[PDB]
Amino acid sequence: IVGGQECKDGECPWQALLINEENEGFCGGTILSEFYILTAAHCLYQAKRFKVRVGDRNTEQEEGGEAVHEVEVVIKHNRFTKETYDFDIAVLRLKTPITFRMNVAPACLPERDWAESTLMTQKTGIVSGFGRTHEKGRQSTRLKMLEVPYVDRNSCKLSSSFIITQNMFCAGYDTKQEDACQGDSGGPHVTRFKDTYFVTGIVSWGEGCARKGKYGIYTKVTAFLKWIDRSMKT
Amino acid sequence: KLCSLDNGDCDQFCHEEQNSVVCSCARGYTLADNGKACIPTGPYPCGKQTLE
Numbered sequence: 001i002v003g004g005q006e007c008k009d010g011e012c013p014w015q016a017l018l019i020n021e022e023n024e025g026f027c028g029g030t031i032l033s034e035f036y037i038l039t040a041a042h043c044l045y046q047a048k049r050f051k052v053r054v055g056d057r058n059t060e061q062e063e064g065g066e067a068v069h070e071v072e073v074v075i076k077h078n079r080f081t082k083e084t085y086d087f088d089i090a091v092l093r094l095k096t097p098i099t100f101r102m103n104v105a106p107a108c109l110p111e112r113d114w115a116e117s118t119l120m121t122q123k124t125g126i127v128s129g130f131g132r133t134h135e136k137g138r139q140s141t142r143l144k145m146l147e148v149p150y151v152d153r154n155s156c157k158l159s160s161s162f163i164i165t166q167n168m169f170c171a172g173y174d175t176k177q178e179d180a181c182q183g184d185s186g187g188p189h190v191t192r193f194k195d196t197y198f199v200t201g202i203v204s205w206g207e208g209c210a211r212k213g214k215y216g217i218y219t220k221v222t223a224f225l226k227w228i229d230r231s232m233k234t
Numbered sequence: 235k236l237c238s239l240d241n242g243d244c245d246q247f248c249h250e251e252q253n254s255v256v257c258s259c260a261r262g263y264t265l266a267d268n269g270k271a272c273i274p275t276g277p278y279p280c281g282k283q284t285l286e
């Protein structure tokens with residue numbers, strides 16, 4: 001996360017972190033329930049074997065609220081392609097259920113029509129992660145969050161050198177230096193409504209980070225609600 | 235204006251059945267008696283930051 005603010009105690013309980021063999025984070029995720037994590041399909045190609053950590057805010061030392069979970073089944077969208085980055089979504093079922101507590105809670109899955117007319121039409125959403133704080137730098141040791149404005153779908157298609165499919169949406173700033181970055185991929189994009197946070201996007205990609213004339217690209221959760229419900233049953 | 239008028243006074247989901255506002259909630263929440271509010275069922279309902 002470039003810019004933004006640090007996630008204070010209890011502010012981003014749905015944040016999940018995928019860690020490799022070296023116990024280091026390489027992507028984020030969103031907690032959907034005690035057994036399921038939502039993330040980006042392209043994250044699955046960032047490490048052979050990985051686990052999921054929840055309740056972490058500072059990767060430097062263990063406070064005692066963190067919990068590591070092994071992945072039982074990986075469900076990646078079969079249509080995902082690195083050539084387009086379309087259908088960038090995946091669901092992970094965990095071997096053991098997540099115990100909810102301070103800094104560990106699921107984000108709500110909204111209904112499709114309501115989400116599109118009420119959440120996606122809001123002025124802003126919130127993105128979070130342990131990603132880089134600059135395009136060039138190491139992964140942040142602290143969990144950060146950032147309020148990102150929903151971007152006009154036409155203005156963003158015009159500003160992109162890559163085709164923005166209907167499975168994607170743009171959020172962020174045209175010139176302001178705030179955006180998600182490397183490492184935040186797979187993480188949560190949630191929209192608040194009456195103090196209740198609903199998952200609306202998955203950090204997907206971007207041309208650089210916080211570049212002028214460029215926006216953050218996210219997977220539109222509403223385009224996959226049926227797919228997600230199915231995956232959380234199979 | 236129903237759902238278009240301040241989300242039909244609904245806490246969460248708003249739908250229109252027979253040209254009338256109908257509220258609903260996400261899993262883990264129960265619709266209150268007034269048919270508008272959403273009441274959590276556990277200590278860690280979805281979408282709520284944990285502040286305590």
Ligand SMILES: O=C(Nc1ccccc1S(=O)(=O)Nc1ccc(Cl)cn1)c1ccc(-n2ccccc2=O)cc1
Pocket residue numbers: 082083084085135162163179180181182183184185203204205206207208209210215216217218
């Ligand atoms: O890895 C990418 N970007 C990048 C580049 C250099 C440095 C840092 C980053 S970053 O990965 O840090 N950026 C991010 C990631 C999340 C968000 Cl929301 C904002 N910025 C990236 C991934 C996929 C595409 N893309 C899209 C469609 C078809 C083909 C294709 O290749 C473009 C670019």
